[PDB]
From a paper:
Aio belongs to the dimethyl sulfoxide reductase family of molybdopterin (Moco)-dependent enzymes, with the Mo atom coordinated by two molybdopterin guanine dinucleotides (MGD). The large subunit, [name], contains the catalytic Moco and one [3Fe-4S] cluster, while the smaller subunit, [name], harbors a Rieske [2Fe-2S] cluster.
The oxygen Ox shared by Mo and As is apical to Mo, at 1.7 Å from Mo, and 1.7 to 1.8 Å from As (distance range in the four molecules of the asymmetric unit). In this structure, the Mo is pentacoordinated and the As and Mo ions are 3.3 Å apart, in agreement with NT-26 Aio-As EXAFS data. Considering the DFT calculations, the intermediate structure (C) (Af Aio-As_c) is not present along the mechanism and, thus, we have interpreted it as a side product and/or a dead-end structure.
Author numbering:
A (entry chain A): 3 to 825
B (entry chain B): 0 to 133
The structure:
């Protein structure tokens, strides 16, 4: 029934849960109680402490049927669950996004949205999917890795693996997988879930001395100006935008600024968006702040470097920089002024932004306030520039502007990633000295075995159509070779598969919650466990580490990813010991793990400690002060890393903001300016633009999480977004004789995919915006292979033509094509 | 014993009194639950009245319960608190926003003999209640 909910009893079990999904890492409670019990409506007779004897006032609660479920544990007993935001958590103050609010619905139940969860190992036995045992899966998987190591070495063993936090990442899981891949197998043939080499989104800012998560969310409350660069934060970092940015724009934080800085003017806060596209976030900012307090710099696609070099050149010419800061704490300023020189007239001609708007941006952001201090300008950026036209060069340009204007290390500032997932990285060093484009290697026929581990690059690779076509073809050779087998031992089957991989085959493994589109190619799938079926640690976009507590069993024999890594490492160790190879066996030592906590102890808590191997950790050398029991005591507020101190009396004490003493992460402790050449669009992308009509912009929808791995089973989400949509200018729609709920083909030299038309008045003629990564119409087919110096793709950098397929009468009947820009 | 809530039957008005796209405020199923009925002017699935175009909704946002306002130009309900928007033409479908429930539909009976519109139930859970009927 849809018209009531079962209240948690006053004495219901309550555990802490960070949201599974975005960077913000909102705090939740999980209430769990026997199915046949319920709380009373009186506030002291239910666990929420809310009075259901009468209508609740607005903002009292976030509670819907989607926020409840009934789980069945391995002992067959049934429990109510209720997953609701924590009012006292500093991150979200009781807010829940549409994505975190669905967490109860996306917990595993045999009958709900999680019915299709992987529950057992699955094997494609040449011509059919069947169940197999864990010992058989391990004998095949480890058998193939061992044979490849013994004949080809580690270069024959390929991974694409999460490196992120939250669900399908975090400190336990990045450690287990990194120890396995890098210490034990020692393969350099590793890409990351969102980028096709072992690299960083933030090489330039890190090299300049500025780690990308350098402030606190509170800094968004203290800013005079917030820049949002290549970022749609209402949709993609909702509760950071809603709980910290908007209160600033509304004037609710002005008294906090004045209390902290008694002798400083604080004008009404203003906001600047650098985005070719007019987004829901721009519309909401204008609604809240007024048009006069929002600047939308609607740049030409790929012209970020020209924008920042113009602004840099202008603030230097105006003397709107911090000369003492530059002299004491920086290197390379005079060189950067020469190499990055660009007039406002040139800047305007390249970006298409009028000179008066470039000047106003700089006047709001950098020109001294009446009281003499520089504006506190927080510079936030995300995939519009991280996947923009030369990732390294755009950060080079932007950090130069930020460093010259001292917008790192002062409260209310920062030049930060908004983030994607949560963060939770602890791993051994990458074991080579080479950047390797793993997708291109697979397409060219390299590798014997490829494991997708908590990712689905069938939906999310750049140039995705070339990838899927090569992997399906290489998979089919293995499937064809497995056909002749009758009563084959595991050993024999390992040889049959290896032989097929000598004839251009590839054995594919997926380690996942669900089959996904990967099952079209995979030979073996292994079932994983998400937070709440396991303990998990991760940090948000202000480095705030929290423990998500286990409160239920995973489906069937689903296992935490760190324990799957342990299982693989122990299988290989046993094989090498049996085969009389004591030196190879020793590479697979150190995985004697019974629980995910053991991976937390072995990785995060050993970083920098005496006797420990080399470890790269977001926790740093004080990570050992964190324990599960200490995080439990901290609650959903956790601690901002790095931890400065722990005692029983004060708990974990953390770090709010980095670089507050102007000591940067460089050889000389100074921030380093960098040259930022303006080279135009990459030639590969410019060839598509010269040939085809539309800019194929792409990214997030507020309602859809990533590759829709849970959402694809959600009846409400499938009603709303039955197919990937492409925002189109209405005049462009008329010229193509298309309207809301028509299907189009989108195509260029790289590939061809499909979307449902979504006319959007705000889209520019010749520009579009397609939902990325989706289960019906994969956007990435039309993205190019072009990457920057460090193999970061220009995912936002592609052009194609649009052809009407036809009217999908059922989309027109059932799907809203109304504006998603709030007026 | 019973599995259904005891919904009142609440007279709203007669269909012919409603003007195209001009919202009528009423409470249902008690005085703490504000609702809107609107004759949309063109048929929609599960519209009622002579022209199958009369719909009604709880106006409390299903995110955190701020009263939504009906926008006549878009035939949507817009939440001023965190900007959720619901389509009055698609059974309260959330266009964009932070809710995890479509805007609750008030079930209207249209009686041809009398021209009477009566609120007789609710599809979905009204904000800030354990059950639609307190
Ligand atoms: N064109 C285009 N392409 C893009 C982007 C873009 O802007 N444009 N964005 C890029 C970016 S920023 C990203 S983050 C990538 C995302 O690309 P992917 O990482 O491929 O996509 P996700 O949906 O995050 O993948 C998570 C997968 O792990 C599974 N899973 C979930 N929880 C767990 C768990 O606990 N364990 C395991 N083992 N599996 C789990 C899910 O079912 C799902 O298949 O896509 C990239 N691709
Ligand atoms: N609702 C929701 N939220 C999510 C996710 C999700 O799937 N759904 N995924 C999470 C993850 S993994 C990520 S990485 C983040 C991403 O968060 P964001 O990076 O904010 O989101 P995107 O929609 O990928 O792209 C941001 C903006 O880049 C703009 N853009 C495109 N080309 C350019 C360009 O050349 N220059 C500039 N300046 N801007 C450009 C686009 O118009 C778009 O509005 O969101 C996270 N949060
Ligand atoms: S509810 Fe979840 S999806 Fe992000 S805005 Fe909060 S961490
Ligand atoms: S209360 Fe309506 S959008 Fe949050
Ligand atoms: Mo991402």
């Amino acid at each position: 029934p849809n018209d009531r909910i079962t209240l948690p009893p006053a004495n219901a079990q309550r555990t802490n849960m960070t949201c599974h999904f975005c960077i913000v890492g909102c705090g939740y409670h999980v209430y769990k109680w026997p199915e046949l019990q319920e709380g009373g409506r009186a506030p002291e007779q239910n666990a929420l402490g809310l009075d259901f004897r009468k209508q609740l006032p607005p903002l009292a609660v976030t509670l819907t049927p989607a926020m409840t479920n009934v789980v069945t544990e391995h002992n067959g007993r049934r429990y109510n669950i209720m997953v609701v935001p924590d009012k006292a958590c500093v991150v979200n103050s009781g807010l829940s996004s549409t994505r975190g609010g669905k967490m109860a619905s996306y917990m595993y139940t045999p009958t709900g949205d999680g019915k299709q969860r992987l529950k057992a190992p699955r094997l494609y036995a040449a011509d059919q999917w069947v169940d197999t045992t864990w010992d058989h899966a391990m004998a095949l998987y480890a058998g193939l890795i061992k044979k490849t190591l013994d004949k080809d070495g580690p270069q024959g063993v390929f991974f694409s693996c999460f490196d992120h936090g939250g669900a399908g990442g975090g400190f336990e899981n990045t450690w287990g997988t990194g120890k396995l891949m890098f210490s034990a197998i020692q393969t350099p043939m590793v890409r990351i879930h969102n980028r096709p080499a072992y690299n960083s989104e933030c090489h330039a800012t890190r090299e300049m001395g500025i780690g990308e998560l350098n402030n606190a969310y509170e800094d968004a409350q203290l800013a005079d100006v917030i820049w949002s660069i290549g970022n749609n934060p209402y949709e993609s970092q909702t509760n950071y935008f809603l709980n910290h940015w908007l209160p600033n724009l509304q004037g609710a934080t002005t008294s906090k600024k004045k209390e902290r800085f008694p002798n400083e003017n604080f004008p009404q806060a203003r906001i600047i968006f650098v985005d070719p596209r007019e987004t829901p976030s721009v519309a909401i900012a204008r609604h809240v702040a007024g048009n006069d307090r929002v600047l939308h710099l609607a740049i030409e696609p790929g012209t970020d470097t020209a924008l920042f070099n113009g602004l840099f050149t202008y603030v230097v010419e105006q003397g709107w920089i911090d000369k003492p800061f530059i002299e004491a704490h920086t290197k390379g300023f005079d060189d950067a002024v020469k190499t990055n020189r660009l007039s406002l007239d040139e800047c305007s001609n390249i970006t298409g932004v009028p000179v008066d708007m470039l000047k106003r941006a700089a006047e709001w952001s950098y020109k001294p306030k009446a009281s003499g201090q520089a504006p506190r300008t927080m510079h936030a950026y995300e995939k519009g520039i991280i996947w923009g036209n030369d990732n390294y060069v755009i950060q080079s340009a932007l950090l130069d502007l930020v460093i010259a204007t001292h917008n790192v290390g002062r409260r209310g500032t920062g030049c930060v990633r908004m983030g994607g997932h949560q963060e939770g990285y602890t791993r051994p060093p990458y074991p080579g000295d080479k950047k390797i484009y793993i997708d291109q290697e697979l397409i060219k026929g390299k590798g014997r075995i490829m494991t997708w581990w908590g990712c689905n690059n069938f939906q999310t690779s750049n140039n995705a159509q070339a990838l899927r076509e090569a992997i399906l073809q290489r998979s089919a050779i293995v499937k064809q070779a497995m056909q002749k087998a009758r009563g084959a031992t595991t050993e024999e089957m390992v040889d049959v598969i290896y032989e097929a991989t000598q004839n251009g085959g590839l054995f594919v493994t997926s380690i996942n919650l669900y089959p996904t589109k990967l099952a079209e190619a995979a030979h073996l799938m292994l079932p994983a466990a998400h937070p709440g079926e396991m303990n998990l640690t991760s940090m948000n976009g202000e480095r705030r580490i929290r423990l998500s507590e286990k409160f239920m069993d995973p489906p069937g024999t689903a296992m935490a990813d760190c324990l799957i890594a342990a299982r693989i490492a122990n299988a290989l160790r046993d094989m090498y010991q049996k085969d009389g190879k004591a030196e190879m066996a020793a590479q697979f030592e150190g995985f004697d793990w019974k629980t995910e906590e053991d991976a937390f102890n072995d990785g995060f808590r050993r970083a920098g400690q005496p006797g420990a191997p080399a470890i790269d950790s977001q926790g740093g050398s004080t990570g050992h002060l964190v324990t599960y029991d200490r995080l439990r005591k901290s609650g959903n507020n956790g601690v901002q890393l790095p931890v400065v101190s722990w005692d029983e009396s004060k708990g974990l004490v953390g770090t709010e903001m980095l670089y507050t003493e102007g000591k940067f992460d460089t050889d000389d402790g100074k921030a380093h300016f960098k040259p930022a050449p303006w080279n135009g669009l990459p030639a590969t992308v410019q060839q598509q633009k010269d040939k085809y009509r539309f800019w194929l912009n792409n990214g997030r929808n507020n309602e859809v999480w990533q590759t829709a791995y849970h959402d694809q089973y959600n009846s409400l989400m499938q009603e709303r977004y039955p197919m990937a949509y492409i925002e189109m200018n209405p005049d462009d729609c008329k010229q193509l004789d298309v309207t809301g709920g028509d299907i189009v083909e989108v195509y260029n030299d790289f590939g061809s995919t499909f979307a449902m038309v979504y006319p959007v008045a705000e889209i520019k003629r010749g520009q579009t915006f397609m939902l990325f990564g989706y289960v019906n119409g994969i956007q990435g087919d039309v993205t190019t292979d072009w990457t920057d110096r460090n193999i970061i793709p220009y995912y936002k950098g592609t052009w194609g033509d649009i052809r009407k397929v036809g009217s999908m009468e059922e989309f027109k009947r059932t799907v809203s094509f109304k504006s998603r820009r709030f007026a | 014993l019973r599995t259904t809530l005891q919904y009142p039957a609440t007279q709203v008005s007669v269909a012919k009194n409603l003007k195209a796209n001009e919202p009528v405020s009423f409470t249902y199923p008690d005085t703490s639950s504000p609702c809107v009925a609107v004759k949309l002017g063109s048929p929609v699935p599960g519209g009622v009245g002579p022209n199958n175009d009369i719909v009604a909704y709880s106006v409390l946002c299903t995110h955190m319960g701020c009263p939504t306002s009906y926008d006549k130009s878009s035939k949507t309900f817009k939440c001023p608190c965190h900007f959720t928007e619901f389509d009055a033409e698609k059974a309260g479908q959330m266009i964009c926003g932070q809710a995890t429930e479509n805007l609750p539909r008030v079930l209207l009976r249209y009686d041809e003999a009398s021209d009477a519109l009566t609120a007789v139930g609710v599809d979905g859970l009204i904000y800030g209640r354990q059950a639609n009927v307190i």
